[PDB]
Design a protein around this nucleic acid. Structure first.
Ligand SMILES: [Mg+2]
Length: 50
DNA sequence: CAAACACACCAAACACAAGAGCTAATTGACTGGCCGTTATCGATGTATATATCTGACACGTGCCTGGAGACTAGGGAGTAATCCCCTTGGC
């Protein structure tokens, strides 16, 4: 999720993949819904426990 | 005249002002009265240090008594002769 959640397409599930360096990554096509810009954005990540 | 409602106006409040995310730094109560502990000032000593006076011992000076010195007066102690009393000695 990205902090300003304007519409439904702003909190979608994803499958986890662990990569060496310390930065969230996501395919560029999925940038448009979130309205992210990879210019120092921040995007939250919640995990269900059930 | 008094009471009903309606309208325009004035006066008084309520709540909102996107989602959030990170970092920094300024504020660290205070006079006063009073009780409770404790430090200090004060008296009332008894122990020890020092000063004055009295007592015993020491060195020194002294007043007094008796002893000692030089010199004197004049007579006590004492040679040298004599008598003859009396003792020792004898048959
Ligand atoms: Mg951007």
């Amino acid at each position: 999720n990205r902090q300003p959640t304007l519409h439904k397409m702003s909190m979608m599930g994803h499958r986890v993949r662990i990569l060496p360096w310390s930065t969230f990554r996501l395919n560029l096509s999925v940038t448009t819904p979130y309205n992210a810009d990879f210019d120092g954005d921040e995007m939250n990540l919640h995990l269900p426990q059930s």
